[PDB]
Enzyme design. Sequence first.
Site: not given
Length: 279
Positions: A19-24, A16-17, A130
Amino acid sequence: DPTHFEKRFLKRIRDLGEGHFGKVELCRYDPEGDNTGEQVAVKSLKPNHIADLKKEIEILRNLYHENIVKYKGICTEGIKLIMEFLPSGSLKEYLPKNKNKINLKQQLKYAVQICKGMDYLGSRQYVHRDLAARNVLVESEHQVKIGDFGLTKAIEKEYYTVKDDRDSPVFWYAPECLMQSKFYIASDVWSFGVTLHELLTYCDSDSSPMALFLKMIGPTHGQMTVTRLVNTLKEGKRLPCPPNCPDEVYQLMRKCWEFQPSNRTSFQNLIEGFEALLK
Ligand SMILES: O=C(Nc1cn[nH]c1-c1cc(Cl)ccc1OC(F)F)c1cnn2cccnc12
């Protein structure tokens, strides 16, 4: 425990989306195996930020608001955040493809909902740090929700001082955050004004807050960019009025960008502001 999810039943559908460290990711929690389980949005870290995610999971777990994404649970051994799935994605992705669907009245209603969700977060003594359209999720054509809390921190004190400023959305930050890494609830009010600008521009790439500021300050300053961004904020220069945006909506936005954290409006006051324009 309905808030405990087993990894073996969590079936990845798609990304879905990121970030640099995170993932959804979109997953189906399917204990029956017949692909009838409920769809969920799953936040995992990319393969150490495990400590910050655990804190974020605990912040979200105790946040209960219609304008904040619902916490559904966890998935352990090492942890994954289980939330409800909002199929229309973020405002950053949804607005450019729905210009015919979303008008000014609707944009201002979204503006209220973001404000309400932000004002509930602040009342629970939290700073977001953020607040941008990419972190706002679309429930439907009538409702938005704050979808991410990766940077969220508890204020003890008018503010919390940040140690790690490495993945900071600098074109959305108030001068105090840029100059001293000082995060007040007013810093979230400043970021709201930037999120407001994106929303009224339908999150257009060519007129993004980053691009509007690079044209203002000069695009060839490398590592001098933040200093020069602070230089232009000091001078009194702000993001321009969005095309087809009435001056009074632009005036409510200008009040989010009063250089001094104390001269800025509160979220309660912004709510009253947009409500008078909606009558
Ligand atoms: O579509 C979704 N997410 C999305 C789309 N693009 N990028 C993101 C995203 C990526 C990260 Cl790393 C963190 C937050 C994100 O969403 C953000 F907009 F709040 C989604 C849908 N329901 N849902 C619930 C909770 C979280 N995400 C989702």
